[PDB]
PDB file of C-alpha atoms and ligand atoms in Angstrom:
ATOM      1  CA  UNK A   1    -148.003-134.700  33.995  1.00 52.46           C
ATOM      2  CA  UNK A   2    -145.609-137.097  35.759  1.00 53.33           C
ATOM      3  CA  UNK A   3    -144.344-136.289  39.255  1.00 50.71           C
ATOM      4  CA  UNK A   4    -140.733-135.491  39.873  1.00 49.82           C
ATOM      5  CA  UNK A   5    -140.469-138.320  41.622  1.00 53.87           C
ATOM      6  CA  UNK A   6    -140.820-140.710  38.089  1.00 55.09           C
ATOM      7  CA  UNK A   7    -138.757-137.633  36.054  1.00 55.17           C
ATOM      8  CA  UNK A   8    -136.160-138.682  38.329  1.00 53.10           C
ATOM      9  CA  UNK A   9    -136.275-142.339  38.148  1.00 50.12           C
ATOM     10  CA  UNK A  10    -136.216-142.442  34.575  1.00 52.41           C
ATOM     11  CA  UNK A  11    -134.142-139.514  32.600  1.00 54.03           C
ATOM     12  CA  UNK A  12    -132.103-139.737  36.308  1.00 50.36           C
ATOM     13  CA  UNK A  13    -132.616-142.763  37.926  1.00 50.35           C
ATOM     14  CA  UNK A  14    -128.708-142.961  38.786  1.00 50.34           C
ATOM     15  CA  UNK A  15    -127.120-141.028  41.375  1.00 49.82           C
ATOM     16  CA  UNK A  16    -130.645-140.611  42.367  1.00 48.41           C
ATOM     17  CA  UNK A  17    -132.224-141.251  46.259  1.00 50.67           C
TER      18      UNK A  17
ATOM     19  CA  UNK B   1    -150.239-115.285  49.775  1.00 53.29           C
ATOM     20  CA  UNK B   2    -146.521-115.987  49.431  1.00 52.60           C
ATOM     21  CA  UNK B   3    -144.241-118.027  47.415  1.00 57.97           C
ATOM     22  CA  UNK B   4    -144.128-121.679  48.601  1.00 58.64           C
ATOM     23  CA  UNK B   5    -141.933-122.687  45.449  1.00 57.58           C
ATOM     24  CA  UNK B   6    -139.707-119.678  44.608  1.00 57.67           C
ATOM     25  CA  UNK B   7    -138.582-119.920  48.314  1.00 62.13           C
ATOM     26  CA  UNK B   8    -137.719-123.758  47.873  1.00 61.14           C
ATOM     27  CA  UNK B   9    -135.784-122.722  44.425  1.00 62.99           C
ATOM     28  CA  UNK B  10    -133.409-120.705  46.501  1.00 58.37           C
ATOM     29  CA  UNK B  11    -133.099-122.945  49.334  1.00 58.93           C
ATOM     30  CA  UNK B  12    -132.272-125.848  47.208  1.00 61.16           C
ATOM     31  CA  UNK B  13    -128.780-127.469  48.068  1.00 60.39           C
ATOM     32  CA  UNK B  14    -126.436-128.958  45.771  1.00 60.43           C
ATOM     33  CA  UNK B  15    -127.413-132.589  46.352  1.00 60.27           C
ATOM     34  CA  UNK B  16    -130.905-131.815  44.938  1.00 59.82           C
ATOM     35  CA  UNK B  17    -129.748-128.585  42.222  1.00 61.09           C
ATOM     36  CA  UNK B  18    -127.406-131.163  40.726  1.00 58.38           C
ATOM     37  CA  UNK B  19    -130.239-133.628  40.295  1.00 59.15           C
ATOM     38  CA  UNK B  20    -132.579-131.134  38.747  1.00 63.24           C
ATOM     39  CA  UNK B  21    -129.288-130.207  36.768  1.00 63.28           C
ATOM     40  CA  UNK B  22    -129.638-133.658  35.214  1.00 62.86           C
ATOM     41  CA  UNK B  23    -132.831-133.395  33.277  1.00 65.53           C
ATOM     42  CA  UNK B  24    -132.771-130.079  32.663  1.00 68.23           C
ATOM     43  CA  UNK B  25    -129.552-130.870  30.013  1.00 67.68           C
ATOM     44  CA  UNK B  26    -131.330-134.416  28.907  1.00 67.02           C
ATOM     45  CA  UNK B  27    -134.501-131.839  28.626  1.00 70.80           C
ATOM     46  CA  UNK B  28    -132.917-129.399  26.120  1.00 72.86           C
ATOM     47  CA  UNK B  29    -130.478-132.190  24.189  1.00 72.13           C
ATOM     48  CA  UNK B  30    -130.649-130.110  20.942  1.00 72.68           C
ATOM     49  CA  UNK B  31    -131.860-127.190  21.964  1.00 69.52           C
ATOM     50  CA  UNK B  32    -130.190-123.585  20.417  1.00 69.93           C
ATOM     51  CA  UNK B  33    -129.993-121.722  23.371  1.00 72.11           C
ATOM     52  CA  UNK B  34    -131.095-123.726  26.592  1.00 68.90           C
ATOM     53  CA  UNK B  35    -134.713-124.034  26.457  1.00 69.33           C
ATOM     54  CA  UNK B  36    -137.764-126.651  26.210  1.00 72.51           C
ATOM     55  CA  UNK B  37    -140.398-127.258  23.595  1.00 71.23           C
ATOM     56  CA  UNK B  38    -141.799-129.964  24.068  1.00 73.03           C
ATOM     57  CA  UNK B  39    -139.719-131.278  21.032  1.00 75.27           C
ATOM     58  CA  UNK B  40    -137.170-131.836  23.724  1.00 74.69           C
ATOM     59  CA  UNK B  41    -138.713-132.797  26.430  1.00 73.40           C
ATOM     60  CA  UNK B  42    -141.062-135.425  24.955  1.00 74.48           C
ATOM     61  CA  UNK B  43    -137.761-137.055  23.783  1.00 72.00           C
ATOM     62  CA  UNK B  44    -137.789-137.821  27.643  1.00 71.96           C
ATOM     63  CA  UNK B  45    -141.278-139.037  27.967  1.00 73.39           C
ATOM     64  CA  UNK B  46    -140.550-141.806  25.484  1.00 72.80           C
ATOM     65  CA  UNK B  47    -138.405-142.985  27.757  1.00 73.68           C
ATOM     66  CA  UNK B  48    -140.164-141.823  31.141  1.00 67.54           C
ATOM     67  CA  UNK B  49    -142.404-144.673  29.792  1.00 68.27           C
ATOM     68  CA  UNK B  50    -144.817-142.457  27.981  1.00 68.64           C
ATOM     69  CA  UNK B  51    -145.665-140.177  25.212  1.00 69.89           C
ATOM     70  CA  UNK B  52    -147.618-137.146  24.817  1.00 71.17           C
ATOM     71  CA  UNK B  53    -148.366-135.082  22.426  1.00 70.85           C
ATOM     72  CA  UNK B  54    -146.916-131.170  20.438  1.00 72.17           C
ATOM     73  CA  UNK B  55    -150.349-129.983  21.634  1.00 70.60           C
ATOM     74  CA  UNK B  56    -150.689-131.279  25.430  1.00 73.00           C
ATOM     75  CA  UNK B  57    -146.996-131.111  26.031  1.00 71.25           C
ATOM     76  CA  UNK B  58    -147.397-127.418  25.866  1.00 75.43           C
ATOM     77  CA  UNK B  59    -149.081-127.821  29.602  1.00 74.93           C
ATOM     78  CA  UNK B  60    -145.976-129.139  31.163  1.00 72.28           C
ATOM     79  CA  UNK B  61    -144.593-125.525  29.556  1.00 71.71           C
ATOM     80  CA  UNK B  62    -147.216-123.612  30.658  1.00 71.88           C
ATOM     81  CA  UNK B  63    -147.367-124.708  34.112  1.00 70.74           C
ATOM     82  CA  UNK B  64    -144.508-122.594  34.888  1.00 73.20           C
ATOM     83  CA  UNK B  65    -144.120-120.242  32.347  1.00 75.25           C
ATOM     84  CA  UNK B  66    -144.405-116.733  33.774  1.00 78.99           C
ATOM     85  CA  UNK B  67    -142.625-114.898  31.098  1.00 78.51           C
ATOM     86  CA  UNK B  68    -144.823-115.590  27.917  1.00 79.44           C
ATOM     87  CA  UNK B  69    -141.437-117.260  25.901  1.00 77.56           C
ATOM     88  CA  UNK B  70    -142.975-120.593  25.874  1.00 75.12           C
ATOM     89  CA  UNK B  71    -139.844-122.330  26.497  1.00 74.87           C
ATOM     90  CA  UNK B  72    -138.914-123.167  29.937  1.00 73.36           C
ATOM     91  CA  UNK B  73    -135.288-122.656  31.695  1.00 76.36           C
ATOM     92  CA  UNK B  74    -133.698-123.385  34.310  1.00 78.78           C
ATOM     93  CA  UNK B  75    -135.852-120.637  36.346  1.00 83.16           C
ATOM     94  CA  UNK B  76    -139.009-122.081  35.284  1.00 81.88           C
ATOM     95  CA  UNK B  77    -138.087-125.877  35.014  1.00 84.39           C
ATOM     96  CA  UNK B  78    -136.536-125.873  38.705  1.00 86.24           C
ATOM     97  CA  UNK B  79    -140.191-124.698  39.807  1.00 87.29           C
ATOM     98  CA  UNK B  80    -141.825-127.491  38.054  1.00 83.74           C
ATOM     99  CA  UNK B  81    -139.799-130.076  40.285  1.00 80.34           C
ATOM    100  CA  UNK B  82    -140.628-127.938  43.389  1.00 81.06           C
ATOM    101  CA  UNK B  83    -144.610-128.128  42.904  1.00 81.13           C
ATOM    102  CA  UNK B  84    -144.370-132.244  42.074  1.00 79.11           C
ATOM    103  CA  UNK B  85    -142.280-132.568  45.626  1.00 81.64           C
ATOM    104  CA  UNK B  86    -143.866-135.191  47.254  1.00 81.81           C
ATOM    105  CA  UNK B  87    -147.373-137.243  46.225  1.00 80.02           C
ATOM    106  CA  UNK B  88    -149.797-136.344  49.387  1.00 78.14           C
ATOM    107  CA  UNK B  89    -153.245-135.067  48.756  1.00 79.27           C
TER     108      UNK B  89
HETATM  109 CA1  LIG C   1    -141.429-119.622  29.451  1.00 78.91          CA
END
């Protein structure tokens, strides 16, 4: 259920990529 | 076999350990010792633009739980960022 990819958009989508 | 995402774990550098860092707090924001139960982590989902359930939740838990607490930590958690790497199947 959800990727890392969204996990780390949302709940971190600063300092992020 | 071998260990495709135990190896990663411990070849993780700090640019990515202090973005799985991140969620793991926002992932146990109440927690009593620095777990997850769902009760926690679907606090994110809300917000991750979704919502599942005490009883389903359990799977994000038990996808990498190998040591029968039920809560995950930073040993188990870590793992579950390594097997959703990149979307290409
Ligand atoms: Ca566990």
């Amino acid at each position: 259920r959800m990727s890392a990819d969204a996990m780390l958009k949302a709940l971190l989508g600063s300092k992020h990529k | 076999m071998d260990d495709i995402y135990k190896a990663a774990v411990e070849q993780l550098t700090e640019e990515q350990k202090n973005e799985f860092k991140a969620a793991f707090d926002i992932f146990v924001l109440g927690a009593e010792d620095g777990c997850i139960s769902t009760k926690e982590l679907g606090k994110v989902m809300r917000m991750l633009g979704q919502n599942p359930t005490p009883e389903e939740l359990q799977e994000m838990i038990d996808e990498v739980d190998e040591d029968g607490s039920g809560t995950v930590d930073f040993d188990e958690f870590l793992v579950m960022m390594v097997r959703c790497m990149k979307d290409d199947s």
